Structure formats: structure tokens, C-alpha cells
Design an enzyme around this catalytic site. Structure first.
Site, PDB file in Angstrom:
ATOM      1  N   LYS A   1       0.876  -1.168   0.000  1.00 50.00           N
ATOM      2  CA  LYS A   1       0.000   0.000   0.000  1.00 50.00           C
ATOM      3  C   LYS A   1       0.917   1.223   0.000  1.00 50.00           C
ATOM      4  CE  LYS A   1      -0.535   0.239   5.044  1.00 50.00           C
ATOM      5  NZ  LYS A   1      -1.501   0.311   6.172  1.00 50.00           N
TER       6      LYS A   1
ATOM      7  N   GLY B   1      -7.744   4.627  -1.389  1.00 50.98           N
ATOM      8  CA  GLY B   1      -8.927   4.561  -2.223  1.00 50.98           C
ATOM      9  C   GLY B   1      -9.264   3.196  -2.776  1.00 50.98           C
TER      10      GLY B   1
ATOM     11  N   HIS C   1      -9.013  -9.243  15.814  1.00 55.96           N
ATOM     12  CA  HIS C   1      -8.527  -8.299  16.810  1.00 55.96           C
ATOM     13  C   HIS C   1      -8.691  -8.908  18.192  1.00 55.96           C
ATOM     14  CE1 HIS C   1      -7.975  -5.130  13.885  1.00 55.96           C
ATOM     15  NE2 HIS C   1      -9.225  -5.261  13.480  1.00 55.96           N
TER      16      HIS C   1
ATOM     17  N   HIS D   1     -16.338   0.191  11.319  1.00 55.89           N
ATOM     18  CA  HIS D   1     -15.258   0.337  12.302  1.00 55.89           C
ATOM     19  C   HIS D   1     -15.791   0.672  13.694  1.00 55.89           C
ATOM     20  CE1 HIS D   1     -12.407   0.208   8.993  1.00 55.89           C
ATOM     21  NE2 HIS D   1     -13.070   1.180   8.396  1.00 55.89           N
TER      22      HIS D   1
ATOM     23  N   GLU E   1      -3.782  -4.067  22.363  1.00 53.36           N
ATOM     24  CA  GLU E   1      -4.394  -4.687  21.201  1.00 53.36           C
ATOM     25  C   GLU E   1      -3.424  -5.373  20.252  1.00 53.36           C
ATOM     26  OE1 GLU E   1      -8.531  -3.396  18.849  1.00 53.36           O
ATOM     27  OE2 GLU E   1      -6.939  -1.929  19.215  1.00 53.36           O
TER      28      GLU E   1
ATOM     29  N   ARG F   1      -7.015   4.137  28.693  1.00 54.06           N
ATOM     30  CA  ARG F   1      -8.146   4.545  29.510  1.00 54.06           C
ATOM     31  C   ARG F   1      -8.855   3.299  30.012  1.00 54.06           C
ATOM     32  NH1 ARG F   1      -9.775   5.337  24.156  1.00 54.06           N
ATOM     33  NH2 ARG F   1     -11.660   4.187  23.575  1.00 54.06           N
TER      34      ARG F   1
END
EC number: 6.4.1.4
Lengths: 660, 126
Positions: free
Chosen positions: A157, A163, A207, A234, A274, A291
Site C-alpha cells: 500500500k 482509495g 482483533h 469500524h 491490542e 483509559r
């Protein structure tokens, strides 16, 4: 911390305050002009207004929140999520003012703003980050060397741009002739740059989020990771607490790696690390959240911990109360997030009143967190979420059954929601098998948003019975106010003399009308003939708390559904679905050319032929013995002829204009 | 098992349904003409009538219970105690129809009907 100010609203504000009350800590909240009658205002011990409804004037303000903390004599501020929760300048301002910030110190927040800074800090600690390269030196010859170093699968990429065009995919070694063709055919006409970056895989990623909790004394523990792969636009829609699909060795490895990562950046507080995984458990770090997150109640069900209490204790200067060897893993928990949105147009948020709100039955294994009460409205200034339903069960399959069982008990009337989507999302053959990856919903999107189905004749019998019994209820409450009590005529029995009574009613099922002939039987039963088929329909109403239920027996088949009738629409909420049947509106309640009021001369005409006016429009003004009369339109359409030009004499009850 | 049909009445029917609700499993019951207003009819999510009050026409019937299971789309049948709970032919009928019988398989039921058969099988095991 004897008093905490919570600079947030809604579900998160109530979640923290319930813990505070449990511990004995006083709670202060803020509510703008927008949340004056929201849930967290009444739950708090004291709350202050700030200013106009948009968040920029209320919850994102740094000075207003401190001013509230000082006047209420708060000892600590909890930012919650979404407003000041990542604001490093606010954490520094609290320190300088003397107020305890509940969260990581500014030194741990600031270094996490830049993704390349945290990548290097953690990589130097032995954290398996996504490596690749961020350099421009990846031309054709260098690309061959880079691909061999990281492995033959490559996704290419641009450094700048995107796009969906000009991208190159490598799935084997002998594909560089295709890479050279694509680099010249299109890629460099849209990107206008030779420099492109490389990653390893895009095939069904997941994830996986593993929690880290640290304190000011140098301790850290990990809590078991979640699977957060199911999303659309998302935005997380559902979440699985124990991250199914991995082995105990993976859980241990993620625990150690996340603690090393949290220590590498000297993180204190409840945070989340993550990781992204492929199909072969090759976990790589991507990002860390700093947080206390809203996702946490789904994990608490399986670890048996209370993270809000933990966060307050270490903020006061205490140690982690429970060590990493004491954290258990029992059962599976799921969260389903319920939004005010209309999926039929690819989920745009909607805002409106909630006329009826009912939650599933309370149970230690069914945790219900709402931020909206019945009678409250959804705003446009803030998150459109209504509620979160969290369930726990002994294993994965039991939890999925409980999640769907309880979710169908959650009833919202007054606006459109995503409840039907959540039910089709969970109750999907591939999701129950475990085929979960980040593209699940767009892969099976057409199978989740389903069209409306026609009602069964038995469901129309239930709608007709509920309407008849509601009319009886109105009759009964009239009688309770009457002097002539106990009298006949009060029993809605339909008892004709020597003959039977048949009521012909019409119900509208979607677009189509169905005629139901209801015969009143002597024994209180009904015989309802729908098209040709006769049903023996019995039933009554009963109350449980503030909800009305319709008890049915149709041809010997007993059932129970919640009966809500709002203006025209009959809602039946059962364990097999939800059906909406509409009552048709007669013409004489929905109908709401012109004449001259007296004999006068016309001052100004307005419209001509070919125009179009809508109802309540000025067509003419006429003066009759010095009294200006402006004609208006009750009718509608397009004018075909105006009969009197301006300055002519019109008479009493003479037609002015015409509609063809 | 997302839905279970309980081919029984009274205390045992309510005992099982309370667990089912606790787990999230939908419950269907049967009530004859005799139990139209009994406890387990209101506790169930759905229930069907069968026939005359004597048990021979309602709870001991093999075909009526299967017919209820098929129309309600039940995945399993729980016989409880006293009616079909020892009926080996019913357990075999459920298997052939495709419905989960909650209990021992027919091969374990049939060999226990004769007291001398189970005596020898167990004696040979110590």
C-alpha cells in the site's frame, strides 16, 4: 478518594457511580443543558450544569470540569471514555491544580500519541510488534529482499494515498512480474509516488485485546483477552469475553507480552493492549489504549474481578489487590450493543423518544447496563447508544443461547433500533460455528438484513384479541368511575338476544389488509374466521409490574406475548419474534374549491394556471366593505383556472379558483 | 438443545422448566383437558392440549407427544418420571424421527427390563 467527579454521561457515568456508592465514595457529575433529566443526574449525589448542549461546550471543556471539581471539593476526577479520557493536557492540569487524575500519568499518555514512538518503546522491550518497514527504500529490487525477510505473503500500500486502487497483493514468490506490470499500469498514476509500504497478511484477521492493570508501586497483572473482531463501519457491535479459538499457551503468552508492553511505557491504571492475529496464532502488537474502557464488564463476568474498584484503589496509592496467579477464567461472556439506528439504510443513527423500555429479567449472570429511561429521548449531540446487555454462561454455546434468549426480551417502542440485526448476527450458522474474523458482517451482509415477513393467521388472531381486550379495559375503567356499579352492559360480552354477534374488523399486515370476522361466543371465547379458517381464540390480560401481557389460547395452543398498543400499531413481543400489526385509520380522521366570504373587490391575485400550492396557502386577497380577507387553501393540487382577475367584483359564495 | 418438550405435569414439569429458563432454553409442555389451568401451563412458553383427562389418552401416548414436538420445533424431549420415562419404544421412536431423547439410549433401556439380564451383566463386572 472520598469524593470523585465523573466528567461523563450516560452508561459509563452510572456504571462508575454504582461502584462508588457500593464503596462509600460520594459522586458528582455534570450534565450540560442537554442531560438535565438524564439517568446519571439523579444517581449522583450532586451535579452541576455547564453550558450549551454540544459536547464542545460541556464535556470536552478543560476549565469547566476543574471548576466543578474545585467547588464540590472533589478529590479525584474520572474522565470515563470519549471526552477527556485521552486528554494529556487535562491530566497535567489536574496535577498542577492538586486533583487526582484517575488514569495513567501524563508521562504515560503523551508518549502514546505517536504510533511510531510506542512501537519503538515496546519493541525494545521484547514485544512482538508489527515490523515491516516505514522507509521509502522499497523499490523493485529492494522489495524482493524485503519480501524474503518477512515472508512471501505481502500486501503493498502507498506511503501516502489510498482509495482501493493501485494496491498489489503477493501470495507466492513468483509474482514479481505481475507486481511490475501493476506498478506501471495504474499504481503510479493515482499515488504519484514510488514509495510504498508492506505488511504481511490481510486474510481473515482477528482483533484480540488483552488487558493490563498496573499500579504506582511497580506491579502489573494481566486479565484474559477478548475477541473484538466483529464490527461494521469500524464500530464494535458485539464482543466475546474469553477470546475463543486459542489455546492456554496463547493466553499465557499474551499476558506476559502485554505486561512487558505496559511496563515498557511505564503505564499505570487499567489499559488495553491490542494484538492482531492470523490463523496460526502469530500475534503482533498494533496499538494500546490508555483509559478504562467501556468493554470491561464483559471480561469481569469471566474473571470475577471489579476493575472500577481496582482503579480507584491504586489512584489512592494502594497496590493491586489481586495477583496474576489469582485470576481465574470461568465460562464465556458476550456483550451486545443496542444503538438507536436504522439498519435499512446501512445504519444511520436516529434520534427520538422512547415510549416503552423493558429490559430482560435480572439475574447474576445477566448484567443489564442502560443509560436511557422510559420517557427519555435520544439526542443528536452524543452517542446514540441505548443499552448494553452482557450475559455469562458455563460455555460458549450456552452463552450464545442465553444472549439471544434475553435479547428478545429487550423491547423498544418509539424508534427504530438494531435489535433485529443483533439477533440475526448472533444466530448465524457461521458465527455459532466460530467463523469469526474482521470481515464477517460485510462477507454475509445480505444474510443479516432481511425483509419483513407476512404475519401468520394465528398472529392476527392475537392482535385482534389484544385490541378487543384493550377496549374492554377502557370499558372497565369507565365503570370503576361510575355510580351504576356492578350493572350489566359493563361486561363486554357481545350478548345479543337469541342470536350471535359477529364483529368484522380489518387489520393491516404490512401493505395488505386482512378481514377478521370475530364471533362472540356465550362462554367468553371468540371464533375468529380469517379468510376461511376459523380459530378458537381465548385469552385475557395480566400485569407484571409496569408491563401488560396478553395470555392467549388459539385452538388449544397456549402462548404469551407482551401487548403494547401505541396510536395505531399493535406490538406483540414473544419468544419467537416481534410482530407489528397496524390498525387502519378511517378517512374521516385523516382528511384534515374555495369561496368568496362576502361581496367585495379583489386587491391582489397570487397564483395562475400551472402553479402548485400546498395546503394553507394564500390564493387571493379581497376587500369587502373595508375588511381585508385572505383566502386560503384547504384543498391541494394544481390550479387549472383563476376566474377573477385583480380589480374585479366577486359576489357571495362565488367560486374563485378551480382544481381540475 | 434450544427448546425442550416436557411430556409431564405438575412438580417435575415445573422443576425442569425453572432450570431451562435459568439456562435460556425454551420450554413446551402438554396439558390434556385436565391440566388446562395447572401450574406448568403458565410457566411454559407454549403448551398444547391432547385429549381426555385420563393419562392413557394424554401423557402415555407415544404419537401425540411426538406430534407436539414436531409442530413446536422442539429439539429434545424430557419424559420426566412416570409416563414415558421407561418406554424404550418411545426412545427408539424419537431417534428415528430425529428428536433428542433426554435419557439413556434404547440399548441401555431394553436390557434393563428383565431383572435376570441386568443381574448377569453387572455380576460379570464385579
Amino acid at each position: 478518594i472520598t469524593k470523585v467527579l465523573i466528567a461523563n454521561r450516560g452508561e459509563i457515568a452510572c456504571r462508575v457511580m454504582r461502584t462508588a456508592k457500593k464503596l462509600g465514595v460520594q459522586t458528582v457529575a455534570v450534565y450540560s443543558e442537554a442531560d438535565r433529566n438524564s439517568m446519571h443526574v439523579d444517581m449522583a449525589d450532586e451535579a452541576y450544569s455547564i453550558g450549551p448542549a454540544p459536547s464542545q461546550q460541556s464535556y470536552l471543556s478543560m476549565e469547566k470540569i476543574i471548576q466543578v471539581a474545585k467547588t464540590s471539593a472533589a478529590q479525584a476526577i474520572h474522565p470515563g471514555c470519549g471526552f477527556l479520557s485521552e486528554n494529556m493536557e487535562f491530566a497535567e492540569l489536574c496535577k498542577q491544580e492538586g486533583i487526582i487524575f484517575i488514569g495513567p500519568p501524563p508521562s504515560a499518555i503523551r508518549d502514546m500519541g505517536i504510533k511510531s514512538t510506542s512501537k519503538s518503546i515496546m519493541a525494545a522491550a521484547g514485544v512482538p510488534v508489527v515490523e515491516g518497514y516505514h522507509g521509502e527504500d522499497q523499490s523493485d529490487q529492494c522489495l524482493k529482499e524485503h519480501a524474503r525477510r518477512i515472508g512471501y505473503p505481502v500486501m503493498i500500500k502507498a506511503v501516502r494515498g489510498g482509495g482501493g486502487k493501485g494496491m498489489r497483493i503477493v501470495r507466492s514468490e513468483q509474482e514479481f512480474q505481475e507486481q511490475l506490470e501493476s506498478a506501471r499500469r495504474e499504481a503510479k498514476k493515482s499515488f504519484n509516488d514510488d514509495a510504498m509500504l508492506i505488511e504481511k497478511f490481510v486474510d481473515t484477521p482477528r482483533h484480540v485485546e488483552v488487558q493490563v492493570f498496573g499500579d504506582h508501586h511497580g506491579n502489573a497483572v494481566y486479565l484474559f483477552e477478548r475477541d473484538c473482531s466483529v464490527q461494521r463501519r469500524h464500530q464494535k457491535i458485539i464482543e466475546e469475553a474469553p477470546a475463543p479459538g486459542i489455546k492456554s499457551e496463547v493466553r499465557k503468552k499474551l499476558g506476559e507480552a502485554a505486561v512487558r508492553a505496559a511496563k515498557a511505557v511505564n503505564y499505570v491504571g487499567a489499559g488495553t493492549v491490542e494484538f492482531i492475529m492470523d490463523s496460526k496464532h502469530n500475534f503482533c502488537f498494533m496499538e494500546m489504549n490508555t483509559r478504562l474502557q467501556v468493554e470491561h464488564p464483559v471480561t469481569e463476568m469471566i474473571t470475577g474481578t471489579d476493575l472500577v474498584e481496582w482503579q480507584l484503589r491504586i489512584a489512592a496509592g494502594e497496590k493491586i489487590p489481586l495477583s496474576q496467579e489469582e485470576i481465574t477464567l470461568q465460562g464465556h461472556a458476550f456483550e451486545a450493543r443496542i444503538y438507536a439506528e436504522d439498519p435499512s439504510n446501512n445504519f444511520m443513527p436516529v434520534a427520538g423518544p422512547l415510549v416503552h423500555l423493558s429490559t430482560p429479567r435480572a439475574d447474576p449472570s445477566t448484567r443489564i447496563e442502560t443509560g436511557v429511561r422510559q420517557g427519555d429521548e435520544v439526542s443528536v449531540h452524543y452517542d446514540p447508544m441505548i443499552a448494553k446487555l452482557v450475559v455469562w454462561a458455563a460455555d460458549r454455546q450456552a452463552a450464545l443461547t442465553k444472549l439471544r434468549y434475553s435479547l428478545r426480551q429487550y423491547n423498544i417502542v418509539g424508534l427504530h433500533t438494531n435489535i433485529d440485526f443483533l439477533l440475526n448476527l448472533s444466530g448465524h450458522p457461521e458465527f455459532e460455528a466460530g467463523n469469526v474474523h474482521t470481515d464477517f458482517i460485510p462477507q454475509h451482509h445480505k444474510q443479516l438484513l432481511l425483509s419483513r415477513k407476512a404475519a401468520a393467521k394465528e398472529s392476527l388472531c392475537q392482535a385482534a384479541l389484544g385490541l378487543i381486550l384493550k377496549e374492554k379495559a377502557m370499558t372497565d375503567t369507565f365503570t370503576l368511575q361510575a355510580h351504576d356499579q356492578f350493572s350489566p352492559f359493563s361486561s363486554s360480552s357481545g350478548r345479543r338476544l337469541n342470536i350471535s354477534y359477529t364483529r368484522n374488523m380489518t387489520l393491516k399486515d404490512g401493505k395488505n389488509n386482512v378481514a377478521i370476522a370475530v364471533t362472540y361466543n356465550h362462554d367468553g371465547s371468540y371464533s375468529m374466521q380469517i379468510e376461511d379458517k376459523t380459530f378458537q381464540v381465548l385469552g385475557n390480560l395480566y400485569s407484571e409490574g409496569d408491563c401488560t401481557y396478553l395470555k392467549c389460547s388459539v385452538n388449544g395452543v397456549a402462548s404469551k406475548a407482551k401487548l403494547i398498543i401505541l396510536e395505531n400499531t399493535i406490538y406483540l413481543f414473544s419468544k419467537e419474534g416481534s410482530i407489528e400489526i397496524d390498525i387502519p385509520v378511517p378517512k374521516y380522521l385523516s382528511s384534515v374549491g374555495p369561496l368568496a366570504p362576502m361581496t367585495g373587490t379583489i386587491e391582489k391575485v397570487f397564483v395562475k394556471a400551472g402553479d402548485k400550492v400546498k395546503a394553507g396557502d394564500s390564493l387571493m386577497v379581497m376587500i369587502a366593505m373595508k375588511m381585508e380577507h385572505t383566502i386560503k387553501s384547504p384543498k391541494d393540487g394544481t390550479v387549472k383556472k383563476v376566474f377573477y382577475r385583480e380589480g374585479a367584483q366577486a359576489n357571495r359564495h362565488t367560486p374563485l379558483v378551480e382544481f381540475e
